[PDB]
Amino acid sequence: AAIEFDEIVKKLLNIYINDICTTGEKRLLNNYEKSILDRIYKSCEYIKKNYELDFNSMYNQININDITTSDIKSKIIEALLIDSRPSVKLATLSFISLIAEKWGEKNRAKIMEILSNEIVEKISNNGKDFIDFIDR
Amino acid sequence: AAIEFDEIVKKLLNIYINDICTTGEKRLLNNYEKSILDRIYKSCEYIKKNYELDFNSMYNQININDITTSDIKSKIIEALLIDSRPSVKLATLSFISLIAEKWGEKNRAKIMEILSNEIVEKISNNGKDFIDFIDR
Amino acid sequence: TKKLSECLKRIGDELDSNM
Amino acid sequence: TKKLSECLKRIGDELDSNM
């Protein structure tokens, strides 16, 4: 039967709903939360723009190599372990943003499992200084 | 210490990256895939707009009740079980879109576990007729 | 007892009814 | 052997260097 469009529809629905969820999550935020989030976009895009060549070489070590996850987590978190500076956190976040930007045909879960749990906790630790580094 | 902004940052990062992932997934799609996806947006938003009151009553049975997931899956899939019509699929998808639109402060996984696996497979089955119902 | 199955069918019926 | 840790620190150093 007509089954040559099944995988296409399957891929688009796992994109549509995820984009609707994001809209729903962004909908239940006040003007302050939206202001901070907007600063994150412009900040991370600025770094990925001016440090694209640096990120690219770091990416080439992380990506093309067929190694399991969490190896990547321990690979990246080391910067957050020694230095708990907001600048390092922002630099780390921008790099993850680059990875998620290049892994479009890969599973969304493969990127989120790197971000969530212990990693997002460390970036959030003393986040008041993190915001003041971005919002000023 | 300054820990009153930790949960705020934690929430924004699980929104930013998810939105970057979606951008990355949308980036690796050709003009045709983008055209079909765009039709899905306008189609589902049209239904949720003209059938908001219908969806609301259905939502009030699914939401406010403290029942575990998969109960919701078996609750909704029944329409897709008997009728495999593209119209029913579109109506089903629009309803999920409504749920994801209202569950902004809830976990993203709570919505995706309903969509993924067996449910997204049934909507994709004979998806050529599904697209032709939307793109025409 | 308010079947979402019946409602979704009814919505789907009114959808393809228009052409 | 190309430590991403060292690079991220170096990037972070050049970031807060500008004020």
Curated annotation (Swiss-Prot), chains C, D:
Post-translational modifications: Ubiquitinated in the absence of XRCC6/Ku70. Ubiquitination promotes protein degradation.
Tissue: Expressed in a wide variety of tissues. Isoform Psi is found in glial tumors. Isoform Alpha is expressed in spleen, breast, ovary, testis, colon and brain, and at low levels in skin and lung. Isoform Sigma is expressed in spleen, breast, ovary, testis, lung, colon, brain and at low levels in skin.
Motif (BH3): 4-18
Ranges in a coiled coil: none
Reported function: Plays a role in the mitochondrial apoptotic process. Under normal conditions, BAX is largely cytosolic via constant retrotranslocation from mitochondria to the cytosol mediated by BCL2L1/Bcl-xL, which avoids accumulation of toxic BAX levels at the mitochondrial outer membrane (MOM). Under stress conditions, undergoes a conformation change that causes translocation to the mitochondrion membrane, leading to the release of cytochrome c that then triggers apoptosis. Promotes activation of CASP3, and thereby apoptosis.
Protein family: Belongs to the Bcl-2 family.
Oligomeric form and interacting partners: Homodimer. Forms higher oligomers under stress conditions. Forms heterooligomers with BAK. Interacts with BCL2L11. Interaction with BCL2L11 promotes BAX oligomerization and association with mitochondrial membranes, with subsequent release of cytochrome c. Forms heterodimers with BCL2, BCL2L1 isoform Bcl-X(L), BCL2L2, MCL1 and A1. Interacts with SH3GLB1. Interacts with humanin; forms fibers with humanin which results in BAX conformational changes and sequestering of BAX into the fibers, preventing BAX activation. Interacts with SFN and YWHAZ; the interaction occurs in the cytoplasm.
Domain notes for this protein: Intact BH3 motif is required by BIK, BID, BAK, BAD and BAX for their pro-apoptotic activity and for their interaction with anti-apoptotic members of the Bcl-2 family.
Name of the protein in question: Apoptosis regulator BAX
Portion of the full sequence shown: 56 to 74 of 192
